[PDB]
């Protein structure tokens, strides 16, 4: 007795389009920046749209009506892209270059690089909106972007496996050990400049 | 003497324009399919004009050879070709794209309304989009050729012949296939319309 | 009370790998053939793995045990690739170039081009096996290949929509009208040779 | 005088070799992940040696300049770089690939067992595969560099410096990062192994 999967299938479709739109902006920046300064800020990107089960789960946790309309108006990380950068300073270069764009707007920002989480997690999280041009309408949609270095990706990926303690203490060691190395690398890369 | 190759810049920013249009096109195809359960775009092809082709074009229109002047005189530096499943898709794509805020129409030539002498049929529009570079916004024209499969079939073959080009023997016979393809693709369209009701 | 989705998810995984393997052989042929004769036989390819529902449905129709093992040993078109060619004669060039390969074996062949189906359908269907090299074993798997021209693809795609009559008679007209045009095209293309 | 560019042939068939190996690698990654719920390959990178690099290499080994002789003397014409998530993945990939019937091992140099003077670490193997061309079968060597992310991080940076190359100031300090990366990536591996039980 319902049609509830109609907006969710709809949901996934329009939010992937937002990822396609943002991915493009990112690639052109990386391309052009490299074309100007002989250096790629972006090592690579990853895109994912939240599974429906995670959406419904998340809606239930905050006690909200279970519909695509309500997920659409309450969940900002439905569409997610992860930008992995070669160097720390690249992270903030991308953030700047993306936000200054006309159709791109900043909604939420959390910088766990300056202020890592308790367990050691480091990463710049921003939510932006872009317009998505559909066959018969324009949707302005939020995309969640995680900007991190290779090192931050490495550590995050492992700590994440553990969620599915004894390792808490030892992970924090790696988190700073990685910070330490990537700054050596950053320092050396900088001295050569372009 | 000293590197006059500003074109590498040209090639760089105009290929970026193609990514932006291509992204737009792909989303229209995707969303229209999600709504009317049918993909208008069969596929797309993208190309940035060879520098060899540019200078030749500049030479022909009697223009100075610099990237700067090509940027403001050649609209088909960046080109994309949208091959559609059915005749009516050609005009759906045209409509869906123009209605987008950041797409601006510059030029339009409809060789479907008025096929060329040799039989060529195709819808040509030039649009502008903004390209967001690391340090500036460049607004660039992309030339878009919209056609059906048959029109594509025919075009690519005619291109091989003319582009020692004899034609001659085939001009007459190519024009026959051009019309024969039109006729059938209308049969196909007629049928497709009736069942999508 | 079962694990029946384990082999099916397994099934889809190993059969896509077969598609990756066959796709590659095809691309190298198209690439190299064009590199030698300045002409691409392949306009494009399409790959698809049968949905589980279609597999189960098909198993039920022939009254077979419902398991991935049994689908694996009875259904040859689990993995399918559709090679669309620019010209009719290209179809048989590809067939030859693919079958002569050491790791490629012909299992089933149906040529609806010489002998179209009653409704007008034209297409060369072959089933081949390739070995698929997995982490811990080698599977030899069947892939079903449909080789057709652009014209044949066009007609097929439309006739297919109709399955989901008045149009039967009129489709057959298009089927031969398309044959007629593509042969004109074939004739003209041939006269220029390479 | 007359087109000596047999290399375009060379570039053509060796890029075909990369497609065949790349396909193999991708399937191993996919299947291993399906079984042990973990991707060994983080990503891959492919490259066919620039002709500029080839002739230079031929010049250095004092060989005649022809595609024919390069074909039988240069094993790294086609090269692929497999970046892995964990140290142990490097050897899993090595093993899974060699056990394939049509992959034949030609050469092996393990700079992880024995890192170079400057700190470089990486597992180098040359394999042969058959390439099925339109009219023949060519058996070609591909050079494969297998490394962890950290080894990749470090390598790409060291490459920028040496490839006016000062090094000097950084050699010492690069070697420090090389060891610092090793140490941590073993911490990571140690932890990952314990939880995958
Ligand atoms: N590896 C790792 N990632 C962290 C950690 N803390 C945050 N993150 C990242 O932050 C992303 C969003 O998680 P949070 O915002 O912190 O919590 P949420 O459930 O999303 O509710 P909230 O957005 O805050 O309102 C995660 O998305 P994910 O899809 O990646 O995971 P996952 O899906 O498990 O989150 C992670 O990428 C951490 O301690 N370790
Ligand atoms: N096959 C074919 N195409 C035609 C014909 N008339 C126009 N076109 C297409 O229109 C595009 C440009 O032709 P025109 O606009 O009429 O002339 P211009 O663009 O000003 O100079 P230009 O053609 O680019 O050198 C071409 O793009 P291209 O990238 O394809 O090449 P190509 O352009 O070389 O033909 C053709 O594909 C025709 O009679 N046959
Ligand atoms: N458009 C069209 N295709 C036909 C027609 N006859 C055969 N085909 C193609 O042949 C493919 C396999 O269908 P068949 O072999 O004829 O019948 P099967 O159900 O597969 O059992 P069988 O293989 O013979 O033992 C189809 O796969 P599909 O995935 O494409 O469809 P679809 O999934 O509906 O088949 C079609 O691609 C036809 O009259 N029109
Ligand atoms: N960054 C770095 N790489 C090393 C080092 N030693 C070996 N390599 C890698 O090994 C590859 C070839 O180096 P060698 O095998 O030792 O020497 P040869 O292959 O015989 O000549 P060649 O290097 O190709 O000119 C390179 O491939 P490439 O494609 O990367 O370039 P590149 O090869 O230019 O270094 C390097 O990536 C090192 O000290 N630092
Ligand atoms: Fe855009
Ligand atoms: Fe193979």
Method used to obtain the model: X-ray
Kindly write down the DSSP assignment for every residue of D124-192, as one continuous string: EEEEEEEEE-SS-EEEEEEEEEEEEHHHHHHHHHHHHHH-----THHHHHHHHHHHHHHHHHHHHHHHH
Chains B and D touch (3+ CB pairs under 8 A): no
What is the number of alpha carbons within 13 Å of residue D127 lying toward its C-beta?
29
Backbone angles phi, psi at D76, to 5 degrees: -100, 30
Q: In this complex, do C133 and D27 lie within 8 Å of one another by their Cβ atoms?
A: yes
| H-helix or E-strand spanning residue C43 | strand C42-49
| Pocket probe mutation, ligand 1, options A156, A172, A174, max atoms within 8 Å of Cβ | A156
Find the helix packing angle between C5-37 and C52-61, rounded to 10°.
Answer: 110
Chains C and A touch (3+ CB pairs under 8 A): no
User: What is the distance in angstroms between the Cα of A174 and the nearest Cα belonging to chain D?
Assistant: 6
- The position carrying tokens 């995680």 is A146
> Which positions in chain C touch B170 (Cβ < 8 Å)?
188, 191
Judge contact between C33 and C40, C-beta under 8 A.
yes
| H-helix or E-strand spanning residue C184 | helix C168-192
Where are any strands of DSSP class E within chain B? 41-48, 78-84, 104-110, 123-132, 137-148
Neighbours of B50 (CB within 10 A): 10
β-pairing verdict for B137-148 and B78-84: parallel
Nearest to D144 by CA among D4, D2, D24: D24
Which residues, in sequence order, are CB contacts of C111 under 8 Å at separation 6+? C124, C125
**Nearest Cβ partner of C167 from B173, B181, B191?**
B191
How far is residue A106's CA from residue A95's CA, in Å, rounded to a whole number?
10
Judge contact between C185 and B153, C-beta under 8 A.
yes
* DSSP single-letter state for residue B134: S
Give the SS3 label for residue D73: coil
**Which residues is D78 bridged to in the sheet?**
D48, D142
Neighbours of D101 (CB within 10 A): 9
Number of residues written out for chain A: 194
Q: In this complex, do C32 and D134 lie within 8 Å of one another by their Cβ atoms?
A: yes
Chains that touch D (3 or more CB pairs under 8 A): A, C
Kindly identify the ligand whose nearest atom is closest to the C-alpha of C123.
3
What is the number of alpha carbons within 13 Å of residue A56 lying toward its C-beta?
8
CA-based nearest residue in chain D for residue A45: D43
Domains and CATH numbers, chain C: 1-152 (3.30.460.10), 153-194 (no CATH)
Which residues, in sequence order, are CB contacts of B70 under 8 Å at separation 6+? B7, B10, B54, B58, B63, B77
Q: How far is ligand 6, taken at its centre, from the CA of residue D10, in Å?
A: 20
Give the SS3 label for residue C108: strand
How far is residue B89's CA from residue C154's CA, in Å, rounded to a whole number?
14
Number of residues written out for chain C: 194
Q: In this complex, do B24 and A131 lie within 8 Å of one another by their Cβ atoms?
A: no
Nearest to C129 by CA among C149, C152, C156, C105: C105
Judge contact between B102 and A103, C-beta under 8 A.
yes
Judge contact between B21 and B80, C-beta under 8 A.
yes
How far is residue B80's CA from residue B82's CA, in Å, rounded to a whole number?
7
Where are any strands of DSSP class E within chain A? 42-49, 79-85, 105-111, 124-133, 138-149
How far is residue B149's CA from residue C150's CA, in Å, rounded to a whole number?
8
User: What is the distance in angstroms between the Cα of A92 and the nearest Cα belonging to chain D?
Assistant: 20
Residue of C133, C140, C143 best to disrupt the D interface, most CBs of D under 10 A: C133
Encoded tokens for A43? 């090592």
**Distance between alpha carbon A99 and the CA centroid of its chain, in Å?**
14
How far is residue A142's CA from residue A170's CA, in Å, rounded to a whole number?
36
Q: In what order do the strands lie in the sheet with D78-84?
A: D41-48, D78-84, D137-148, D123-132, D104-110
Nearest to D142 by CA among D197, D98, D189: D98
Number of residues written out for chain D: 197
Nearest to B16 by CA among A25, A43, A130, A105: A25
Atom of ligand 3 nearest to the CA of C54: 33
Judge contact between A95 and A27, C-beta under 8 A.
no
How far is residue B33's CA from residue B36's CA, in Å, rounded to a whole number?
5
* DSSP single-letter state for residue A76: S
Which residues, in sequence order, are CB contacts of C37 under 8 Å at separation 6+? C194
| Pocket probe mutation, ligand 3, options C156, C162, C167, C171, max atoms within 8 Å of Cβ | C156
User: What is the distance in angstroms between the Cα of B171 and the nearest Cα belonging to chain A?
Assistant: 39
Residues at the binding site of B for Fe(3+) are 20
């Amino acid at each position: 007795a319902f049609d509830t999967l109609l907006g969710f299938v709809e949901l996934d479709h329009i939010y992937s389009s937002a990822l396609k739109e943002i991915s493009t902006k990112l690639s052109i920046l990386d391309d052009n920046f490299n074309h100007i300064y002989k250096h790629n800020p972006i090592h690579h990107m990853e895109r994912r749209v939240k599974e429906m089960r995670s959406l419904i789960e998340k809606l239930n946790r905050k006690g909200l009506q279970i519909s695509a309309e309500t997920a659409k108006e309450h969940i900002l990380d439905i569409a997610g892209i992860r930008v992995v950068c070669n160097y720390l300073d690249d992270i903030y270069l991308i953030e700047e270059m993306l936000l200054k764009q006309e159709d791109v707007q900043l909604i939420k920002r959390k910088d766990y690089i300056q202020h890592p989480k308790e367990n050691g997690y480091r990463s710049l999280h921003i939510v932006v909106s872009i317009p998505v041009f559909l066959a018969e309408r324009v949707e302005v949609l939020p995309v969640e972007i995680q900007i991190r270095t290779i090192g931050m990706d490495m550590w995050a990926s492992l700590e994440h496996k553990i969620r599915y303690e004894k390792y808490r203490d030892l992970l924090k060691e790696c988190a700073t050990e990685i910070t330490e190395v990537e700054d050596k690398l950053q320092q050396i890369h900088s001295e050569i400049t372009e």
